[PDB]
Amino acid sequence: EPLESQYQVGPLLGSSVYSGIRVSDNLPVAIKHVEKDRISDWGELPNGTRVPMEVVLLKKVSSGFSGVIRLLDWFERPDSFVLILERPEPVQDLFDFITERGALQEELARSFFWQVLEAVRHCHNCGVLHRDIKDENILIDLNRGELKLIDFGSGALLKDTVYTDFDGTRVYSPPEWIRYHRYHGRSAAVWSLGILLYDMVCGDIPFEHDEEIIGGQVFFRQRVSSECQHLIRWCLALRPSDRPTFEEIQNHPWMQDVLLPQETAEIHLH
């Protein structure tokens, strides 16, 4: 069944991802093109079919929990792969949302961060490590108030052993990566979630340079509650083993009394 018949292709979105529509029911989709010559990590499916790791990772997390953008279909071509993904509309990415709104109210940030935590727990439970958690890789469904993770292209199978490669965003990467070119998955994820939470409540990331990342100093440029400052500093512990678990984050006093997604939409997005 050809790709060119099953889907109607619209204009670009970024990069190489196009707006599109599935003919069999006019579903909004996103159509992502990846050049074979640019892929580093290759997985195998049950079929044995050699595919990009991104396809392997997306299939493991696309089980129906809505906190991740689901892969609906994919196709191989001579020099490229084509991924069919879901497209919420209306949608805005968290980077653009924070750029326009500035620093978020703790209540909104609490809802957003909670949903990211549930989505990352989902990936971990499915054996997938994202490795590029940042505002740019989070979509907001503005009507539903639901956050969705995108871009598993820097991703990996979750292991308990050390990682020595990283193609994610340097300013969200942990001090142990900067210093020693080594990290563990969970502990690095919690560091990047510390950067993301700072980003939400202060209106930008805390660190631009290697020195700041390894420095172990977090200055708040914005009024932030003591409980929120405490959680951020805990996620941004220099020693990986000093960082909280996903459990400890979600049991943290700052994380209590979270809004439902619809409540979040009604109060803050509509």
């Binding site: 980077f95 924070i98 750029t99 590029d132 940042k134 740019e136 871009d151 292209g153 820097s154 193609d167 994610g168 965003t169 340097r170 300013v171 969200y172 209106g203 930008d204």
Partner: peptide, 8 residues
Amino acid sequence: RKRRRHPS
């Protein structure tokens, strides 16, 4: 103090 996207 320019807020900007960062490549991966």
